Design a binder for this molecule. Structure first.
Ligand SMILES: CCCCCCCCCCCCCCCCCC(=O)OC[C@H](CO[C@@H]1O[C@H](CO[C@H]2O[C@H](CO)[C@H](O)[C@H](O)[C@H]2O)[C@H](O)[C@H](O)[C@H]1O)OC(=O)CCCCCCCCCCCCCCCCC
Ligand code: CLA
Ligand code: CLA
Ligand code: CLA
Ligand code: CLA
Ligand code: CLA
Ligand code: CLA
Ligand SMILES: CCCCCCCCCCCCCCCCCC(=O)OC[C@H](CO[C@@H]1O[C@H](CO)[C@H](O)[C@H](O)[C@H]1O)OC(=O)CCCCCCCCCCCCCCCCC
Ligand SMILES: CC1=C(/C=C/C(C)=C/C=C/C(C)=C/C=C/C=C(C)/C=C/C=C(C)/C=C/C2=C(C)CCCC2(C)C)C(C)(C)CCC1
Ligand SMILES: CC1=C(/C=C/C(C)=C/C=C/C(C)=C/C=C/C=C(C)/C=C/C=C(C)/C=C/C2=C(C)CCCC2(C)C)C(C)(C)CCC1
Ligand SMILES: CC1=C(\C=C/C(C)=C/C=C/C(C)=C/C=C/C=C(C)/C=C/C=C(C)/C=C/C2=C(C)CCCC2(C)C)C(C)(C)CCC1
Ligand code: OEC
Lengths: 82, 447, 137, 335, 32, 35, 340
């Protein structure tokens, strides 16, 4: 009923753990926060900002219409201030 | 005192079945939670309440309850003084502290059992005399409560009557229906379409009157139980244990939970469409009204207008011949309402009154109720599932009905659960089949 | 793709003169539109009379013209039929009937202008959606 | 005779009957027999029914052009609504069959009997000295029949809106429901499929694990089933070897070792899940529908940016717009 | 023709139900 | 016993734990974006 | 030999068993779940479906999704380094590269996982009836997420990974395939529904036919983890159902295999139906019905009613559900009933 690993109960209870994780856990949190709040995420995944779905006048959708020249076609969609 | 060697943790409260003292603490602390909510919620509602705005458009379910009792409202359900709402809220919230005190006290300080610290309050589940007696006490307490309503209506102010002659207004009932033939007649009424059983009550005279009967009958039975014991059959029929008594009251609440669901959904009287929303049928009736009113103004002869099916665009007949509204609204021809009745004749909707007695207040009433049908989403988006976000609304009639059906059902489950256990607890196999004496093994093979 | 002041420029009166609303007014109008209109006029239609919508073109062919701040504001005080040959404030929310339509009691002239602006701005944004019904949802 | 009535009660309550006719059985047996007989006759030979009360009869019986899949027993007329419509309320049977008379006779008798059937599942358990609550598990499928046959018609105001008694007819009930209520986007429904998916999952789980950890008592060319005799003392499978395997599939503490904690979970999950799905239909019977995220996410200008929720709405409109062709005269469907 | 086939199979299932219930193999204990 | 620290369990745990909180922080920030 | 030493390490009894299977399972399984959770929060479906599909755009847990690639893509594998994305990561996301990512990876993860079942069973020395069972979920994923779109025009018509995005997949099959009318699907639900019954009824049967092996009411503690006697009365269970239902089990070994058979068989039947829908070989209509419906305008069944619902679903949904078709349906051509 036991294996090599240190029983979770002990670790989650150890002061050493929290001394570590009071630093580590919030760190990742603030990092992920910055990832969005700095708008970096928008660029990593090409996700449109609230002001970047259409052009001002245009009401059409930037649908990719051919596989091989898709990447080029996409870039052209960003051109019209979209 | 009590731990794993009694019940499991997740069945903790069952360790108090035989601890009268602590079991009283629970009930007194619990009753505080009910008073606390009622109080704290009323103030929550009031704090958001907007006077010059319909109550049903504000997510209120407690302030409209006070309104019905003739408090802070006037002509047409107009909100006059919000002070009574504030009072009812704060007084409760205070009383919750008093009850909570005793609750906490009896559960962690006071006697863990009562039998010795006072033989009057101490009790035995199998003591058919004490049980019928304690039952007799509450049967009176509830009885006086029933008369507390009668008092408010006949003496201390009245109730909100939507059926008011001059139009919906607070009215003092000074003529309660006391005729037993009429009162108890409701109980002999069908529960289907038309004959609506208890929910079919349509005037405050019966409401007040009926409560007089209940009030007296309840106390009468309250005294009866104090001075008696269960008979012969009464003892050879029921199961006498702490759980059994619980089960009996569980199924009881379940039944009342279902009755309450239909009441808030159908009844127009004790649930005013001015404070709550318009009832389901009421809303569908209003649309037929609205467009009968419109198109007629465009020069259409509603009486002879032929719909796609050739049935009657605006007006048709009920299966018994009465003139009713047309369309899918043919199912709600049982609807009765203050705004609609003046158009009704001896044979149903009169074509002449319809033709020239339509009042403006009725037109905008129809439009209002039409545009406030009890249709909405969980995230509170008023309308059909295909509607667009804009109108944040869900009829209080919808909230109450759904919530209390869920509760009523689960309580029916709780009933079966606790009734099934009590029967097995009594006979004594609620913990498994006796390995040695296995009953089935003593019965002939049917094969 | 944003709510520019270029978009928030709507006709003030019949004589071509225009007015430019602010993002504060728009939001305020939109909110007030939900408070007192959405009930029957959700998404530019009219539940209790689908024949007449809040399309700018429809308001233009109204009598008097209701396709401007001034038209709409007047309507919200003394509403009429499409030909204007009949006042309908008794069966329609308005200032002169606030006793009958309590929602209209709070409403002040600022609110009226905000609401008016909203009706003229939405079709600039939504387009055919604002006028049509379920077809365009 | 020790006393006729006393003997009667002893016969009813008798646990020596091939089929336990209980006290609940005294109500169940006649009611279930009336329901089934009427159904069978209806499903085969019943004439078309004006379900929507718009004088537009819908034939749902075999003899009238249907097969098993399409055939059904059509719900009572919308002209009757929630009115009670027994045979003795009709000028003739011809009228009774036209207004969907049989339907009420069936659903009422079934629901009554199916309730006593639950009542009997307690009784026999009581008579045999075993624990109750078996009936409590059956409360879940019963509460659904109740929600589908009674609660929804009450809420909507007509029995014509109750689920028809047939295959394709059941499909209509669903499709339309989705349109009027957006049920797929409702938590209670989602909990339902979860219990139903999980159920089938766990049913396969338990089923497999046990049958895979059977103690060898059979030949190589002999049915592994014969390695069990009815009325055994000891267990027929190594629950300790079962736990050892499944405990290694995921991780030990995420595996059952208590057969009683196992079978409780096996029972609890689907029953609870279906309980919610039944409450879902019962809740949406009062038009408290699923989440409405239509035109939620919009861009900086105000343009509507569509989601899958919007694509769902388009499918829903189509259902709404086309259902009950000639039944509607007015813009809003409040019925 | 179709109607007959449908009722026939149905009648057969009901027939099976009968035999399955009242003409099953008697479930014998221990000594099986 | 003298348990070790870095183990295979530790690796597994972190492969899910570390990104999760990083995502919970990112999403938490999204609640303040508007237009 | 290094092999047997490599073997030694892998098959070591840890907290989380690795094994040879793990070399395939854990990498894919993690990337699949990870890819989903990634796209769910960050990547959009604007350039592919004209849809917002992430938390970043404002979608919630229900409306979020990893949407399928464009119809232009065809059945392209959409490799990160493929002709489409050309090594670019951002472009790859925008072209719905994460979908084929999740799909193919998850596919191998399901392979690794069943292999894990096979490997662990072998080690523990138990029968692999857990692997046989897991074949049903495989068939479904394969038939639905791979075979089906491989029969259609492109990956675009495969189910997109997301809650709501699956709901449309249901409605689509209704509107377009009349999937509910398919005999193979019906067998499907019968197995799942019948399987969810067996699950319920058996557990409850057991919990309420138990022997008393303790003095407490919470009978959970009173169980012997080390076999011995049957914890519940199989004999009592038999006589019970034999009197309330008329039929009853009497062979635990059969009862449990039956619990395996029913839901596994069902899922397999539903798979076959979907394989038929790929070529669009659906169970849409009954020719005898339509022929009468054409000649006779008074003939109406619940079957005919449903088809009208389908016509509406198709007409009102197609435009925004199939952007690549540039559909334009005038108000007047839209099929509608009266008033609505
Ligand atoms: C396993 C789980 C099992 C779960 C079982 C759940 C059972 C829930 C049923 C609720 C009990 C109904 C009792 C009651 O509240 O009964 C009342 C309800 C509602 O009755 C309604 O009563 C209404 C009363 O009219 C009212 O409303 C009208 C317009 O709505 C007007 O406003 C009018 O003024 C006003 O009086 C109308 O008559 C409606 O046509 C009528 O349906 O009965 C109903 O329909 C019930 C339909 C009859 C079946 C009940 C059999 C019970 C055994
Ligand atoms: C008058 C009402 C009432 C009363 C007094 C009791 C009293 C009792 N019940 Mg009981 N029961 C009731 C209604 C009631 N029940 C109903 C309606 C049901 C149907 C669901 C049940 C189902 C039930 C079962 C299945 C069992 C009991 C048991 C018991 C006994 C032990 C108490 C216990 O287990 O606490 C422990 C309490 C808990 C573990 C709390 C459970 C929390 C619930 C399930 C969640 C509620 C959801 C909530 C609204 C959401 C909140 C959001 C959250 C994030 C905060 C006790 C005598 C137990 C027993 O020993 O039987 C005799 C037992 O096994 N009851
Ligand atoms: C309505 C809710 C409710 C109520 C009133 C009670 C009441 C009670 N439970 Mg209980 N219980 C509940 C829900 C409830 N339970 C639920 C949901 C569960 C499942 C988790 C349990 C599980 C459970 C177990 C397992 C046991 C009890 C026991 C008891 C009894 C003794 C309490 C105790 O040990 O004191 C201990 C008190 C403390 C540790 C201090 C708590 C602080 C107090 C009580 C709360 C203060 C309230 C408020 C903030 C202060 C207001 C002050 C103001 C008025 C001035 C008591 C009658 C025990 C029993 O059988 O009695 C012998 C027992 O063993 N319960
Ligand atoms: C049961 C009676 C009841 C009813 C009919 C209502 C009705 C209402 N409340 Mg209310 N409320 C209640 C009890 C009730 N409440 C209680 C007990 C509390 C104290 C916590 C509150 C606190 C409260 C607040 C603070 C507010 C309301 C508001 C409202 C209104 C808006 C409803 C809304 O948006 O909710 C939507 C809510 C949901 C969709 C949540 C449903 C939760 C379900 C029941 C969970 C079920 C899961 C299940 C239990 C899981 C267990 C299974 C497990 C054991 C396996 C509405 C009129 C709002 C209002 O007035 O604004 C207009 C408001 O701000 N209520
Ligand atoms: C469910 C209600 C209820 C019940 C049945 C009991 C029962 C009991 N309490 Mg108790 N208690 C309660 C609520 C309740 N309490 C509340 C809410 C509090 C908080 C204030 C307390 C605080 C409390 C303390 C501090 C003590 C008790 C004690 C006792 C025991 C001795 C009897 C006693 O003190 O009465 C003596 C008093 C009377 C017989 C007369 C009281 C009459 C009052 C003043 C009028 C009540 C009016 C009522 C609301 C309306 C009813 C009239 C209506 C029918 C018209 C007894 C078992 C004592 C104890 O533990 O000893 C064993 C003790 O020391 N209780
Ligand atoms: C809720 C409060 C309450 C409770 C719990 C009880 C409890 C009890 N009363 Mg009782 N009683 C009460 C109030 C209450 N009483 C009132 C207010 C009065 C004054 C009228 C009486 C007058 C009274 C008398 C005169 C007697 C009792 C007796 C009894 C005991 C046996 C009851 C019994 O076997 O019924 C079982 C009921 C039946 C077997 C008959 C079933 C047929 C029912 C009535 C019809 C079907 C119900 C249906 C589903 C509901 C539809 C509604 C209907 C109108 C259509 C029991 C302890 C008896 C006793 O032992 O004396 C001490 C007794 O003789 N009661
Ligand atoms: C062992 C686990 C495993 C497996 C089976 C896969 C499987 C897959 N991954 Mg993958 N991946 C994994 C782990 C794994 N991944 C890990 C841990 C990561 C994180 C770094 C990734 C990150 C990742 C990304 C970022 C992508 C994939 C993709 C893919 C798919 C296409 C890859 C391809 O073309 O293979 C190619 C196969 C091989 C290279 C095997 C060659 C083996 C031979 C024996 C070696 C011969 C080499 C030699 C030079 C040949 C000489 C011949 C001479 C003529 C030149 C495929 C389903 C792609 C995808 O899903 O597209 C939609 C994609 O874009 N993976
Ligand atoms: C492929 C599988 C990948 C697994 C990756 C690692 C997962 C780590 C899980 C740690 C949890 C654990 O160890 O048990 C935590 C505890 C077990 O407690 C254990 O106690 C032991 C005593 O010797 C040791 O101390 C262990 O360290 C300790 O974990 O809980 C269990 O008893 C049952 C957990 C079962 C969880 C199943 C998943 C259900 C999750 C519920 C979420 C719904 C809300
Ligand atoms: C008119 C009116 C009114 C009044 C009412 C009333 C008067 C009521 C009453 C009611 C009542 C008065 C009721 C009663 C009931 C009863 C019951 C509910 C019973 C039950 C019973 C049971 C359940 C039993 C069972 C059994 C049997 C039978 C056999 C043996 C065993 C047993 C015991 C199980 C009101 C106020 C509303 C308002 C106005 C109108
Ligand atoms: C894509 C990709 C990749 C991958 C990455 C990854 C793998 C990531 C991961 C990620 C992750 C891994 C994430 C996670 C997340 C999670 C989350 C975000 C969670 C949340 C949760 C929650 C929210 C919860 C809730 C709840 C529940 C459900 C239960 C009940 C209660 C509660 C409420 C608590 C790579 C680079 C390789 C390559 C490229 C592509
Ligand atoms: C036994 C027990 C339990 C239970 C407990 C309880 C249930 C308690 C209760 C408690 C309570 C039941 C409490 C109450 C409280 C109340 C209070 C404390 C009051 C307050 C009031 C005030 C403070 C006043 C006034 C006001 C106004 C008039 C307005 C403004 C605001 C204010 C609010 C200030 C538990 C489960 C935990 C555990 C086990 C044991
Ligand atoms: Mn059969 Ca529920 Mn769409 Mn109103 Mn009719």
């Amino acid at each position: 009923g036991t294996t090599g690993e240190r029983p979770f109960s002990d670790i989650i209870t150890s002061v050493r753990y929290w001394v570590i994780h009071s630093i580590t856990i919030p760190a990742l949190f603030i990092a992920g926060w910055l990832f969005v709040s700095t708008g970096l995420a928008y660029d990593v995944f090409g996700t449109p900002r609230p002001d970047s779905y259409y052009a001002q006048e245009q009401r059409s959708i930037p649908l990719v219409t051919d596989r091989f020249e898709a990447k080029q076609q996409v870039e052209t969609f960003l051109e019209q201030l979209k | 005192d009590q731990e794993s060697s009694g019940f499991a943790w997740w069945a903790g409260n069952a360790r108090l079945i035989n601890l009268s003292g602590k079991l009283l603490g629970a009930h007194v602390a619990h009753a505080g939670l009910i008073v606390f909510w009622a109080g704290a919620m009323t103030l929550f509602e009031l704090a958001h309440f907007i006077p010059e705005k319909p109550m049903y458009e504000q997510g209120l379910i407690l302030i409209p309850h006070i309104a019905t009792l003739g408090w802070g409202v006037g002509p047409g359900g107009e909100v006059v003084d919000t002070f009574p709402f504030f009072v009812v809220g704060v007084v409760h919230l205070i009383s919750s502290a008093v009850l909570g005190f005793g609750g906490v006290y009896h559960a962690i300080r006071g006697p863990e059992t009562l039998e010795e610290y006072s033989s009057f309050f101490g009790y035995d589940w199998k003591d058919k005399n004490k049980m019928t007696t304690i039952l007799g006490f509450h049967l009176i307490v509830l009885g006086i409560g029933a008369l507390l309503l009668v008092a408010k209506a006949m003496f201390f102010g009245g109730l909100y009557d939507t059926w008011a002659p001059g139009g919906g207004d607070v009215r003092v009932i000074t003529n309660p229906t006391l005729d037993p033939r009429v009162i108890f007649g409701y109980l002999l009424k069908s529960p289907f379409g038309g004959e609506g059983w208890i929910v079919s009550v349509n005037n405050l005279e019966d409401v007040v009157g009926g409560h007089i009967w209940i009030g007296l009958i309840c106390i009468a039975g309250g005294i009866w139980h104090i001075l008696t014991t269960p008979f012969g059959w009464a003892r050879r029929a029921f199961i006498w244990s702490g759980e059994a008594y619980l089960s009996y009251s569980l199924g009881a609440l379940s039944m009342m939970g279902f009755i309450a669901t239909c009441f808030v959904w159908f009844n127009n009287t004790v649930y005013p469409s001015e404070f709550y929303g318009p009832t389901g049928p009421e809303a569908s009736q209003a649309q037929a009204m609205t467009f009968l009113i419109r198109d007629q103004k465009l020069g259409a002869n509603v009486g002879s207008a032929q719909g796609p099916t050739g049935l009657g665009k605006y007006l048709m007949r009920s299966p018994t011949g009465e003139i009713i509204f047309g369309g899918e609204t043919m199912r709600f021809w049982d609807f009765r309402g203050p705004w609609l009745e003046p158009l009704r004749g001896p044979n149903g909707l009169d074509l002449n009154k319809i033709k020239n007695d339509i009042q403006p207040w009725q037109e905008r009433r129809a439009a209002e109720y039409m545009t406030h049908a009890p249709l909405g989403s969980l995230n509170s988006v008023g309308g059909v599932a295909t509607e667009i976000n804009s109108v944040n609304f869900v009829s209080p009639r919808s909230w109450l009905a759904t919530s209390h059906f869920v509760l009523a059902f689960f309580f029916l489950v709780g009933h079966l659960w606790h009734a099934g256990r009590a029967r097995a607890a009594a006979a004594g196999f609620e913990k498994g089949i006796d390995r040695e004496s296995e009953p089935v093994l003593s019965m002939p093979s049917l094969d | 793709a944003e709510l520019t002041p270029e978009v928030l420029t709507v006709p003030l009166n019949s004589e071509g003169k225009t007015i430019t609303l602010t993002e504060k007014q728009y939001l305020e109008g939109k909110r007030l539109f939900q408070y007192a209109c959405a009930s029957c006029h959700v998404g530019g239609i009219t539940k209790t009379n689908p024949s007449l919508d809040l399309r700018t073109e429809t308001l233009a062919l109204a009598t008097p013209p209701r396709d401007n701040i001034e038209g709409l504001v007047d309507y919200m005080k003394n509403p009429t039929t499409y030909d204007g040959e009949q006042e309908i404030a008794e069966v329609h929310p308005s200032l002169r009937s606030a006793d009958i339509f309590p929602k209209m009691r709070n409403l002040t002239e600022k609110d009226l202008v905000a609401i008016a602006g909203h009706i003229l701005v939405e079709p600039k944004i939504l387009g055919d959606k604002w006028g049509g019904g379920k077809v365009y949802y | 005779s020790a006393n006729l009535w006393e003997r009667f009660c002893n016969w009813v309550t008798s646990t020596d009957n091939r089929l336990y006719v209980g006290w609940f059985g005294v109500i169940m047996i006649p009611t279930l027999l009336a329901a089934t007989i009427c159904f069978v006759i209806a499903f085969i030979a019943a004439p078309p029914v004006d379900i929507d009360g718009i004088r537009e009869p819908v034939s749902g019986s075999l003899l009238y052009g249907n097969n098993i899949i399409t055939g059904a027993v059509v719900p009572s007329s919308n002209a009757i609504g929630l009115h009670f419509y027994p045979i003795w309320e009709a000028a003739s049977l011809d009228e009774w069959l036209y207004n969907g008379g049989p339907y009420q006779l069936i659903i009422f008798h079934f629901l009554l009997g199916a309730s006593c059937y639950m009542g009997r599942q307690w009784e026999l358990s009581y008579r045999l000295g075993m624990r109750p609550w078996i009936c409590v598990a059956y409360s879940a499928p019963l509460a659904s029949a109740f929600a589908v046959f009674l609660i929804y018609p009450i809420g909507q105001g007509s029995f014509s809106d109750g689920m028809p008694l047939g295959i394709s007819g059941t499909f209509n009930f669903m499709i339309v429901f989705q349109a009027e209520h957006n049920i797929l986007m409702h938590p209670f429904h989602q909990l339902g499929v979860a219990g139903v998916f999980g159920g089938a999952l766990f049913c396969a789980m338990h089923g497999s694990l046990v049958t895979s950890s059977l103690i060898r008592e059979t030949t190589e060319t002999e049915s592994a089933n014969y390695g069990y005799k009815f009325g055994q003392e000891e267990e027929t499978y190594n629950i300790v070897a079962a736990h050892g395997y499944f405990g290694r599939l995921i991780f030990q503490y995420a595996s059952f070792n208590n057969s009683r904690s196992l079978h409780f979970f096996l029972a609890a999950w689907p029953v609870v899940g279906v309980w919610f799905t039944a409450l879902g239909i019962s809740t949406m019977a009062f038009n408290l529908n699923g989440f409405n995220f239509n035109h939620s996410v919009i861009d900086a200008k105000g343009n509507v940016i569509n989601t899958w929720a919007d694509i769902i709405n388009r499918a829903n409109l189509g259902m709404e717009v086309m259902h009950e062709r000639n039944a509607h005269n007015f813009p809003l469907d409040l019925a | 023709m179709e109607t007959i086939t449908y009722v026939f199979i149905f009648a057969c299932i009901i027939a099976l139900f009968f035999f399955a219930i009242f003409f099953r193999e008697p479930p014998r204990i221990t000594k099986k | 016993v003298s348990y070790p620290i870095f183990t295979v369990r530790w690796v597994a745990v972190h492969t899910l734990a570390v990104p999760t909180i990083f995502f919970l922080g990112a999403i938490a920030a999204m609640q303040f974006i508007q237009r | 030999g290094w092999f047997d030493i490599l073997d030694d390490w892998l098959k070591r009894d840890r907290f989380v068993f690795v094994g040879w299977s793990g070399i395939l399972l854990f990498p894919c399984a993690y990337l699949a779940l990870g890819g989903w959770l990634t796209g769910t929060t960050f990547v959009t479906s604007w350039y592919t479906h004209g849809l917002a599909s992430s938390y970043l755009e404002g979608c919630n847990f229900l409306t979020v999704a990893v949407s399928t690639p464009a119809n232009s893509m065809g059945h392209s594998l959409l490799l990160l380094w493929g002709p489409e994305a050309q090594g670019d990561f951002t472009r790859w996301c925008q072209l719905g590269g994460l979908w084929t990512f999740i799909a193919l990876h998850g596919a191998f993860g399901l392979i690794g996982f069943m292999l894990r079942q096979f490997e662990i069973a072998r080690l523990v020395g138990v029968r692999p009836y857990n692997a046989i069972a897991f074949s049903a979920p495989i068939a479904v994923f394969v038939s639905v997420f791979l075979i089906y779109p491989l029969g259609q025009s492109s990956w675009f018509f495969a189910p997109s990974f997301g809650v709501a995005a699956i709901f449309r997949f249901l409605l689509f099959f209704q509107g377009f395939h009349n999937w509910t009318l398919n005999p193979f699907h019906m067998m499907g639900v019968a197995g799942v529904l019948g399987g969810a019954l067996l699950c319920a009824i058996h557990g409850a049967t057991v919990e309420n036919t138990l022997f008393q092996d303790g003095e407490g009411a919470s009978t959970f503690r009173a169980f012997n983890p080390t076999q011995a006697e049957e914890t519940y009365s199989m004999v009592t269970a038999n006589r019970f159902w034999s009197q309330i239902f008329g039929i009853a089990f009497s062979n635990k070994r059969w009862l449990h295999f039956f619990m395996l058979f029913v839901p596994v068989t069902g899922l397999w039947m539903s798979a076959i139906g979907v394989v038929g829908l790929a070529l669009n070989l659906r169970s849409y209509d009954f020719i005898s019905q339509e022929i009468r419906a054409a000649e006779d305008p008074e003939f109406e069944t619940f079957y005919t009613k449903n088809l009208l619902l389908n016509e509406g679903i198709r007409a009102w949904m197609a435009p925004q559900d199939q952007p690549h078709e540039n559909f334009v349906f005038p108000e007047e051509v839209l099929p509608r009933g009266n008033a609505l």
